[PDB]
């Protein structure tokens, strides 16, 4: 009923329970959270059942309750509400109730394919799957206040319900109340930051592997109803490969493989995914189209071309993605280092990398610069000048660079850690004997190389002495002193690089 | 079906999606998470749908994926699993499937009422309410490996399903798989830390208010079927940590406050009776101890009087003080300290766990008996703390009554909203800087006693800000304002001196 | 059959299996061990079943296989045999077979009641009870070559079979063979040595308690057909070593201790009467001598008052003191010494063997009469010892009563003494700002079923490397060491339980503990 | 009856009477000795007939009352009880009574044939025969807490009653009481010590001869129902410690000693078959190992040939040498040592218990492979000893045959002391009658040793005479006192006892 709902709200109030310690990792589950289209402001109504966990009091504004976006820009990211007593509904319009459960988020830039996938789609995908029901029942509300933008068709693949924008809320009524709303997006799937504080680069601690990216890739291919060769990403407008035709022959010749071109302009996104999905190698100028890297099969190679004066190590979103553990991709960066081979466009508008709007002394400085200096966001004019350059690729130079990584023809465990060693014993005679059972999970496992690392510290000292043994039982003779206390740590190693957990330390007396 | 479930698991694998940046704030939602009773070890099975978000690789063991307990003791807190390929189920016993959705947690100390409420019940209550369904459908699994303990009846009030302990899992089969399990507990409702690293005291950043405590109190009263004549309630103890002069105190209080006085006891009353009595008490008097956690059931306006024995400094032991003084709890708190050794009775001949000291060297016993105040200390079983906390106490009535009266003038017994942003902030420079703004939107529907505006003025470049508290929506800055300069201007609304609202978008103003 | 037995022996041979590492503690079980009365020599016959365990080869003669007596005099004590092939019986007389199982021992001095009980009866009693059957079936053979002597009636109480002496063996035939013989006597029940090597005194390591003495006492009372009004019993002597003032002493004692007083005498009473009287006496007063060995018949709680004549130091002559003060005997012991020469009567004109001295140099006679204390000495019949021990004595009653009263305050007359088990499940544990070592244990298993007045625990604490132990007596099962405990050190911790200060239990396995 | 037994115990108590001065040589006869399966502890109940001889008080724990094992390892060896008043049975479970007489002992290692025979079977055999009845009536209780182990069939040959292990006691009830139990084992039949304190080797003073070993051998053959054509018997091994050239050795021996040659194997034969074969062998050839303890079954006159692998020194490992050379065993013993490294095969990759060394630091592995002789060592599983003892061996036939031939010239195959001299007279002229037992005896060489000490000095002057009468002239001084001892000697080495000293002036 409406008169039922309106009383639940009028006496009960808003109910907020959020997971996370800080605003950076917070996702809030609300009941009877309301939105004034007049005020353009979310509303928490204090009633007699009303709960606000966390209760930050005035730290709610330092800087905000929640991040609506994954992109830490100190602006679109922030969600906050404004407080009223539920009583005050009497002096206010009649609420319109949103009945179906909502996920309320912000899109940083729904015109850019990298932003769309990295910032929005992968987060939305796994944020929905954090809370039971949401995935198949939730309607997305985008409150940042952009239109559908160039890639809305992709957003629409996440819920089976039509997402709403802020513009569309204005029409629905002057006062909206969500019966059940989640607000915020996990940042767990992010790997890159666009340089708001220090210059752009990979996140310090990446918590997503290839596996979880591929599982999202599977879902997106199937929802695009789309289920050997080198694939070259073309651009028709700007940031061109001036010698496309030469490159297509050179690659075909060098790698003994068919070569296709694909274009975001000239193909449905479904076609792009169909083509990227079975490509053995993907060649592209640095740009948003390379985020389709996440659709490449295991074994494929990414070749990223950078124009004159743009240093590949300063611009590593697609490098970072390709080199994630479990992505099983190879990555090559090639840099145009020959000024004869670049075409600049200084007469263009400022937003397309033009420089005629600047002092003549700055224009000079920019044209003399052989490398774009490191910089903060956003729209740095030297970065734009260079990134909107058209490029003649030096084929011999490209092929050398690819060949340093791809020896032979390009194209096609899960990586389990061991358990603790069990029942670690030690024993003296000066001889120290240490023994242990295999880790429990090893019993049900075939692993090529299985070693045990044993650390030996004389209590008092900080010197550790490592040993890699193959057997479950070893007797230390060398450097072992009588009437001494030894601390002994032990861990199992799969295939040299998968280090398992250490068992409880052993105290051993000689 | 079983053969259905077993295939979903055998080819699909375990699916893990967790909220939170570190192991400290992580709660994980699992599908087809399994537990070997042989190995005493949770199992993640890698299949072809299997997801592990976060994927920490080897940082999963530094120190763990999750905290199972709210109590950061670096031991019971830690949840981890061991990895297999789903394939490997063929070489392994037949799974037993837990069909109903599970919440898997650890209890720090289910024998202590403070630990039970603070560490377990309030966290369980609000962790369940984080995820849709869980509250009314979830079966709790306690993996720490205690028995029911003294307060299991209270745990049982949270789910309508019988909670299971680790001992009971062993019987169910050699290999358990949860179709749907949440693991971990929010620490958001905690207000105290028991001194594992630095000495015990309140959490530095408490994120729970009286509102959220009371809403949990309502739920627990209703589940205990328990819902002119006002009274003072005195918590008695029959075993140890006695008030030697109970009868004297009951008369003194009655006389001083003109109010009936009842005693209640955890030993001599069902917990439902305790809550019935605490629920309508105008004042609650108790020696420091777990029984005082029932403070959270007191009505708005009531007073807590906490008595500390000889050599125990109230400010070193503040769990019940912290709870009573939480914003929106609307309780008053008094600490009284026994300062007179003639009024204490020590018990040094008792077992170590009841504060005895005869188990120590003779020189330590001396040191302890000579000590006039328990020195600050880390967890846990500090022998001087136990010696003093298990003292019986003759309360100096005149001293108690004076102490209460410094806080409770008259008879004991029966807002909080922040402003919005100021709107449409304008500035204008004629050197004179004029700044103006509309009231915050929510002020329109609000009656607040004192409403001020704070204006910060920063010359762009400098880190000097210059604050001003105005009453009016319009001010003109005169001296100190330089011509041909850029000023940044922040503005926020303040309710009743202490409720600081958010700052509006900065203004850039040029002179 | 005889022709059966004779073949078993003629082809089979002697069979010897003995318990013990040395001749001092050896008891041998023989089959077809033989004795030539002509040669005065035991014979081991090597046949085709014949066994000799131990096989000492030539160490059999260094000095002997076995001790026949408990008394280490290096002579009567020794048992040995001589070897022949069983074949050689053909060139030798017809064996006479002893059919019943034998115990073959030597008696050191069967004319002396102390020697009889200490050396022979208590050993025979418990040696018989070492081997199943023997007690009720064994005939004793005494090979030392004394007659019955003054106390044969007592020997006869041990087996229900008439013991045989060496004299009687000579008649039986020129060649005897025991079908089944035990040889030797346990020394386990001995508490005294008569000073063959160093001067007489208690054995250094006594392995018998009151319990095992009393159980032998019970047996001997029952075999003697003997089992407000409490009394003091005074052992009199009619011949020598007299109390000259008996009548005075009997009144003085009666008066002082408010108790009837009886006299008893080995000469004037059947041994059964002596035991009847000693068995219920609250106090036993006697001159030092063999009659005081009847001390072993006193009830729990009684007091022994031993009188020594002039110049005899009680601490030099402690067989009856040692017996009375054995654990579990629960007797009190008083020694009184005649200190006043006016109160002794010497007898220097008697034969040398009864303490006479006229057979010595006149300078030695002088030296002996001038001597105020018999100097310590070796066995046997030292002439100063005999001169003084055969003295008659007027007892100084005031002096005696003072001496008794130092021990018997109030009226004279009326645990088992169990050791604890190991402490169990001994744990230890450290802290991490200052070093604290916690040690705990469960009570010993047997404590569960036991009420003991004082129960303490002794804990020894050794820093590994040092030899310094540091002891502690605790009352509780759980202690935390703070003092002198160093961080980053290894401590060895021993723990034992103590009942009533003096019953020290076994140590548990050592704990290694790290700080 | 049960209610009879229970009263005898409840009022009477435990009764203990033991033979021996120390714990090393003690055997105890108990009545109403009890065992708590809960406490894992024997119980002495003090009643009113109760006897405890010896009463060591607190020396009962220094270190123990008794040795349960013959093997002095300071652990399995020790038997002790815990004391209660018989009264306390009221607060305790209902006793289960063992009615038949018991012998309670510990087995050191019932998986090893040498340990089984040397430590357990021979001791049990002669311990039972120390006390009348026991042999034919006793049930053995093994409290060490091993299973039956590989040789239980042999233990079962001693009593006619099924021996019990500690595991099986737990089932019988919470509280067991033996009506009649002997506890401990004679060490009198032991000849070897396995090196717990000083390195392994023969006991310094061996108190058992071949006679007593053979009498035990006869008993064990009869209980195994096993009782021109002569032969050499070679002990083969299938698993480890192999003779790599068995076939060559069997032909060489056959040809050299003109004699059939059989192989036997503990794996491929019932122990009864092994004894059947060893019992009539003229020569027994084996690698050093437990199988050679079957030496005690060889006939009088047979030869034992013990082969030691590379770097194992025969003189450091002498249990079978010691056994073979016991007086009255009438065996010949040959030790051969593999001296040639080309003729050994090591197995360092095997598990540690089969002589592997891959579990050690790399510098120890080096040290071990460089070593030409296993250094002397204490018990137990020394890794160099194991490395070498699990070697397979190609036997140098010429070298072996040389070694055997130093002792067996021709074909292989098939001790009384005197009495005292009597009536010793002196006058320096000294005379004596023959020892009594000499009258009934034919001895090849019969000499007399006379010691001559001038009273005061400690110088003795020995003389070996053939006649019963001699006159000393040399170094004899007038107006002196001489002490004269005299003993008879059979065949140079059997020294008889000395007669009573003579004083001669
Ligand atoms: Cl779902
Ligand atoms: Cl709900
Ligand atoms: Cl008997
Ligand atoms: Cl027999």
Q: Is D243 helix (H, G, I), strand (E, B) or coil?
A: strand
- Neighbors of chain B by Cβ distance (3+ pairs < 8 Å): A, C
Cα torsion for A283, A287, A288, A289, to the nearest 10°? Answer: -20
CA distances from D498 to C62, C63, D415, D468 (A): 10, 10, 18, 15
3-state secondary structure of D324: helix
Distance C11 CA to ligand 2 centre (A): 103
Which 8-state DSSP code applies to residue B205? S
Q: How far apart are CA D456 and CA B254, in angstroms?
A: 109
Ligand 4 center to residue D139 CA distance, Å?
A: 15
Taking contacts as CB-CB distances below 8 angstroms, the residues of chain D near A474 are 359-360
Residue C348 structure tokens = 């220097």
Closest CA to C98 of C179, C7, C35: C179
Query: CB distance C36–D60 less than 8 Å?
Result: no
Minimum-distance CB partner of C482 among B352, B358, B364: B364
- Nearest bound ligand to CA D101? 3
Structure-token pair, residue D34: 């009890």
**Which residues on D lie below 8 Å from C18 (Cβ)?**
130, 188
Q: Does residue C77 sit in the same domain as residue C104?
A: yes
**B103 and B214 part of one domain:** no
DSSP 8-state secondary structure symbol assigned to residue B13: B
Which residue of chain C has the CA closest to D134? C132
Instruction: Give the pairing of strands C303-308 and C260-264.
Output: unpaired
Give this entry's resolution in angstroms. 2.8
The rounded distance, in Å, linking the Cα atoms of C102 and D26 is 23
Q: Name the one residue in this structure whose structure tokens are 């490029």.
A: A391
Chain C residues near residue A507 by CB distance under 8 angstroms: 514
Which of A58, A209, A211 lies at the smallest CB-CB distance from B418?
A58
SS3 of residue C345 by DSSP: strand
HSE-up of residue C130 (Cα within 13 Å, Cβ side): 31
Strands C181-183 and C201-202 turn out to be unpaired
Q: Which ligand is nearest to the CA of D132?
A: 4
- Per the omega criterion (within 30 degrees of 0), is the bond before B43 cis? no
- For residue A205, the domain's CATH number is 3.40.50
- What is the enclosing helix (H) or strand (E) of D503? strand D502-504
Of A375, A403, A431, which closes a domain? A403
The residue count for chain D: 505
Query: What is the SS3 assignment for D161?
Result: coil
The residue of chain C nearest to residue D487, with distances taken between CA atoms, is C61
Nearest by CB to A460, from C464, C488, C512: name it. C488
Q: Is the dihedral of CA D194, D200, D201, D205 positive or negative?
A: negative
3-state secondary structure of D151: coil
Distance separating alpha carbons of residues B295 and B299, to the nearest angstrom: 9
CB atoms within 10 A of CB B90: 8
Mark whether B330 and B452 lie in a shared domain.
no
User: Are C475 and B358 an interchain contact pair (Cβ–Cβ within 8 Å)?
Assistant: yes
- CA of C134 from ligand 3 middle (Å) equals 7
* Pair of tokens at residue A334: 């090639």
Q: Is A383 within the bounds of a domain?
A: no
In this complex, the residue of C91, C133, C449 whose CB is nearest that of residue D132 is C133
Mutate to test the interface with D, among A477, A478, A479, A480 (most CBs of D within 10 A): A477
D273 and D124 in a single domain? The answer is: no
Q: How far does residue C124's CA lie from ligand 3's centre (Å)?
A: 13
- CA D351 to chain A, closest CA, distance in angstroms equals 10
With tokens 């023994």, the residue in question is A435
Cα–Cα distance list, C131 to B411, C181, C279, D182 (Å) = 94, 11, 30, 10
Closest to B319 measured CA to CA, from B206, B240, B416 = B206
Instruction: Calculate how far, in angstroms, residue B209's C-alpha sits from the geometric centre of ligand 2.
Output: 20
For B133, the closest chain A residue by CA position comes to: A132
- D92: nearest CB among C208, C328, C449: C449
How far C128 CA lies from chain D's nearest CA (Å)? 10
Nearest beta carbon to residue C482 from set B352, B358, B361: B361
Based on C-alpha coordinates, what's the Rg of chain A?
A: 29
Q: Min CA distance, C418 vs chain D (Å)? A: 6
Q: Which residues contact C433 (CB under 8 A, 6 or more apart)?
A: none
Spatial separation of the C-alpha atoms in residues C476 and A260, rounded to whole Å: 87
A→C contacts (Cβ < 8 Å), by residue, are 459-460, 483, 485, 507, 509
CA distance C207 to C213: 11
Query: Do the domain assignments include residue B483?
Result: yes
Determine the distance separating the centroid of ligand 4 and the alpha carbon of C60, expressed in angstroms: 24
Q: What CA–CA distances, in Å, run from B35 to B56, B98, B178, D9?
A: 21, 11, 8, 54
The length of chain A is 510
Transcribe A27-55 into DSSP letters: EEEEESEEEETTTTEEEEEE-SS-EEES-
Q: Identify the closest residue of chain B to C483 by CA–CA distance.
A: B361
Last residue within a domain, chosen from D131, D158, D187: D187
The residue segments making up the domain with residue D296 are: 201-346+391-405
> Rounded to an integer, what distance in angstroms lies between the CA atom of residue D257 and that of residue A422?
59
**CA-wise closest residue to D398 among D345, D346, D343:** D343
**Which SS3 state, helix, strand or coil, does residue D351 take?**
coil
Q: How far apart are CA C457 and CA D263, in angstroms?
A: 63
Question: What's the rounded Cα separation, in Å, for the pair C408 and C401?
Answer: 10
* A397-412 residues labelled b (16+ CB within 10 A) or e (exposed): ebbebbeeebeeebbe
Taking the CA of residue A476 and the nearest CA in chain D, the distance in Å comes to 6
D181 & D208 share domain? no
In this structure, the answer to whether residues D177 and D309 fall within a common structural domain is no
| Ligand 2 centroid from CA A19, angstroms | 15
Domain contains D357:
no
Contact between D360 and A475 using a beta-carbon 8 Å cutoff: yes
Residue D451 and residue D462 in contact, taking contact as beta carbons nearer than 8 Å: yes
> Which residues in chain C have Cβ-Cβ distances shorter than 8 Å to D84?
418, 446, 449-450
Q: How far is the CA of A53 from the centre of ligand 2 (A)?
A: 15
* Nearest-by-CA chain D residue for A477: D361
Strands (E) in A269-360, as ranges, are 281-285, 301-306, 330-335, 342-343
Distances (CA, A) of A109 to C284, C452, D39: 118, 87, 77
Return the structure tokens found at A304: 């990223």
Per the structure block, which two tokens stand in for A160? 């089976």
Distance of CA B485 to the CA centre of its chain: 50
| D315 in the same domain as D239 | yes
Give one DSSP letter per residue of B355-417, joined into a string: T--TTB-HHHHHHHHH-SSPPP--SS--HHHHHHHT-EE---HHHHHHHHHTT--S------P
Q: Do chains B and D touch (3 or more CB pairs under 8 A)?
A: no
- CA–CA min distance B348, chain C (Å): 13
Residues B181 and B43 in one domain: yes
Report yes or no: B395 and B339 within 8 Å, Cβ to Cβ: no
Neighbours of chain D (3+ CB pairs under 8 A): A, C
- Chain C partners within 8 Å of D83 (Cβ): 416, 418-419, 446
Beta bridge partners of A105: A142
Q: How far is C468 from chain B (nearest CA, A)?
A: 19
Nearest-CB residue to B215 (from A49, A101, A189):
A49
Q: Write out chain B residues lying below 8 Å of A326, CB-based.
A: 55
Quote the ligand 3 centre to C135 CA distance (angstroms). Answer: 6
Is D102 within the bounds of a domain? yes
Radius of gyration, CA atoms only, chain D: 28
Q: How far apart, in Å, are the Cα atoms of B6 and each of B9, B163, B177, B279?
A: 5, 25, 10, 50
**A408 part of a folded domain:** no
Which residue does chain D place closest to A478, by CA atoms? Answer: D361
Contact (CB<8Å) C211/D80: no
* D153 and D36 belong to one structural domain: yes
Are the beta carbons of A21 and B187 separated by less than 8 Å?
Answer: yes
Within a domain: D177: yes
* C141 bridge partner residues: C104, C164
Rounded Cα–Cα distance for residues D396 and D243 (Å): 11
D358 lies in some domain: no
In terms of domains, do A317 and A427 share one? Answer: no
The answer to whether B455 and B470 have CB atoms below 8 angstroms apart is yes
- Token pair of C451, please? 């009420």
Backbone dihedral angles phi then psi of residue A411, each to the nearest 5 degrees? 125, 175
Q: Which ligand is nearest to the CA of B138?
A: 2
Cα separation of D366 and D355, whole Å?
A: 15
User: Which among A17, A48, A327 is the top mutation candidate for probing chain B, defined by the most B β-carbons within 10 Å of its own β-carbon?
Assistant: A17
Q: Which chain A positions have a beta carbon within 8 Å of D363's beta carbon?
A: 477-478
**Cα of A128 to ligand 1 centre, how many Å?**
8
Instruction: Please indicate, yes or no, whether residues C52 and C180 belong to a single structural domain of this protein.
Output: yes
| C249/C332 same-domain check | yes
Q: Residues in chain C, how many? A: 515
Residue A384 lies in a domain: no
What is the least distance, in Å, from the CA of C423 to any CA of chain D?
12
CATH number (domain holding residue B500): 2.60.40.10
Question: Residue C440: its chain B contacts at CB < 8 A?
Answer: none
Of A190, A225, A259, which closes a domain?
A190
Count how many domains chain D has.
3
Q: Cα(D417) to centroid of ligand 4, in Å?
A: 27
Give the CA angle between residues A169, A171, A172 to the nearest 5°: 65
Using only C-alpha atoms, what is the Rg of chain C?
29
Q: Please give the Cα distance from A229 to A252 (Å, whole number).
A: 8
Q: Tell how far CA B194 is from the center of its chain.
A: 12
Do B360 and C478 make contact, defined as CB atoms within 8 angstroms? no
Sheet holding B423-429, edge to edge: B423-429, B433-438, B474-477
């Amino acid at each position: 009923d409406y008169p039922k709902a309106l009383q639940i709200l009028m006496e009960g109030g808003t109910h907020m329970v959020c997971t996370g310690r800080t605003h950076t990792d917070r996702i809030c589950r609300f009941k009877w959270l309301c939105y004034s289209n007049e005020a353009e402001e979310f509303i928490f109504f204090h009633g007699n059942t009303s709960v606000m966990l966390p209760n930050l009091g005035s730290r709610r504004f330092q800087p905000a309750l929640l991040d609506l976006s994954t992109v830490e820009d100190h602006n679109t990211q922030y969600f906050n509400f404004v407080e009223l007593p539920a009583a005050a509904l009497r002096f206010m319009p009649k609420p319109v109730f949103v009945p179906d459960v909502a996920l309320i988020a912000n899109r940083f830039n729904p015109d850019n394919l990298m932003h769309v996938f990295h910032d929005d789609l992968l987060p939305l995908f796994y944020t929905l799957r954090q809370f039971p029901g949401l995935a198949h029942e939730a309607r997305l509300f985008f409150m940042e206040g952009w239109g559908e933008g160039a890639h809305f068709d992709l957003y629409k693949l996440l819920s089976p319900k039509q997402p709403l924008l802020r513009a569309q809320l204005k029409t629905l009524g002057r006062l909206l109340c969500f019966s059940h709303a989640f607000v915020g997006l996990s940042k767990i799937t992010t790997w890159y930051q666009y340089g708001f504080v220090q210059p752009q680069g990979p996140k310090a601690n990446i918590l997503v592997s290839g596996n979880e990216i591929r599982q999202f890739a599977r879902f997106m291919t199937e929802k695009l109803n789309v289920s050997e060769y080198i694939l070259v990403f073309s651009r028709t407008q700007n940031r061109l490969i001036l010698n496309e035709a030469e490159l297509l022959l050179a690659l075909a010749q060098e790698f003994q493989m068919k070569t296709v071109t694909v274009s975001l302009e000239d193909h449905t996104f479904a076609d792009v995914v169909r083509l990227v999905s079975n490509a053995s190698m993907l060649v592209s100028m640095h740009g948003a189209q390379l985020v389709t890297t996440l659709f490449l099969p295991r074994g494929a190679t990414v070749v990223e071309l950078f124009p004159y004066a743009v240093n590949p190590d300063h611009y590593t979103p697609y490098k970072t993605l390709a080199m994630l553990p479990g992505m099983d991709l190879q990555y090559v960066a090639w840099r145009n280092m020959m000024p004869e081979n670049t075409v600049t466009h200084p007469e263009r508008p400022w937003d397309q990398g033009g420089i005629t709007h600047l002092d003549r002394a700055e224009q000079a400085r920019i044209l003399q610069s052989r490398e774009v200096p490191r910089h903060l966001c956003c729209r740095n004019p030297e970065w734009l000048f260079r990134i909107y350059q058209d490029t003649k690729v030096d084929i011999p130079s490209l092929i050398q660079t690819i060949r340093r990584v791809v020896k032979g023809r390009p194209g096609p465990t899960v990586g389990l850690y061991p358990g603790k060693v069990r029942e670690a014993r030690c024993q003296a005679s000066a001889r120290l004997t240490v023994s242990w059972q295999i880790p429990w999970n090893l019993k049900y496992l075939k692993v090529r190389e299985v070693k045990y690392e044993v650390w030996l510290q004389e209590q008092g000292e900080n010197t550790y002495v490592p040993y890699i043994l193959a057997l479950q039982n070893h007797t230390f003779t060398e450097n072992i002193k009588p009437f001494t206390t030894y601390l002994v740590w032990v861990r199992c190693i799969f295939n040299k690089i998968l280090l398992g957990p250490f068992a409880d330390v052993l105290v051993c007396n000689t």
